[PDB]
Amino acid sequence: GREEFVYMAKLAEQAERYEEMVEFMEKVSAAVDGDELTVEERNLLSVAYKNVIGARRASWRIISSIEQKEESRGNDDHVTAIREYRSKIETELSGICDGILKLLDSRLIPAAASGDSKVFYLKMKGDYHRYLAEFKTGQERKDAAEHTLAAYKSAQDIANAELAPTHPIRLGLALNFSVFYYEILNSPDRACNLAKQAFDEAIAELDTLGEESYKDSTLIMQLLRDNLTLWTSD
């Protein structure tokens, strides 16, 4: 049942056993055929996959640094061992992304009925194609980068048309889209322009706020500034 698996997902979260949280939410999604996940369920699913992928991304990064350092020292035996270990982490990364992408393409995106949900899931699709682009090479990298740009640019079209410039989902899309430009496409100018644009469009309607609603918007907008601060001084 949907209720039971949501509860198990909350138990896994508390226990920080995120691989099992993914499974419980994977079963929540299966129990919700055609209908949309609740905001709560939608957020639990993303918290479940973010941590799971977050750990492997962390591992992959630290392992890559070690590989390069060992390459600089000439330890071929160490480099060989590191590459096989990195390849194992990359296999997990591929499987984690494939799991959420399979769910996004076949169930979540097709069922999204509001502009809110449409910009959330497409954004998530771009996020996890972006994670693939972080480590893939060759044709698989370009295929992942293009799927990211397609999903982000699509999500952008709906966001500009149906979401306020201060909406957290829209701001999050602009932040991640700008990161995509800087890191994956190595286009710093396009990254800065998008981050500033999304920020300027927000501050224009920011003062038309409540008191406890722009807590989430101010958080994303500060990240946009921080990235701009780093990108502007090289």
Binding site: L171, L173, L175, V179, L219, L223, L230
Partner: peptide, 6 residues
């Protein structure tokens, strides 16, 4: 040390 969305 860049930041993506939470």
């Amino acid at each position: 040390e860049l930041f993506s969305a939470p």
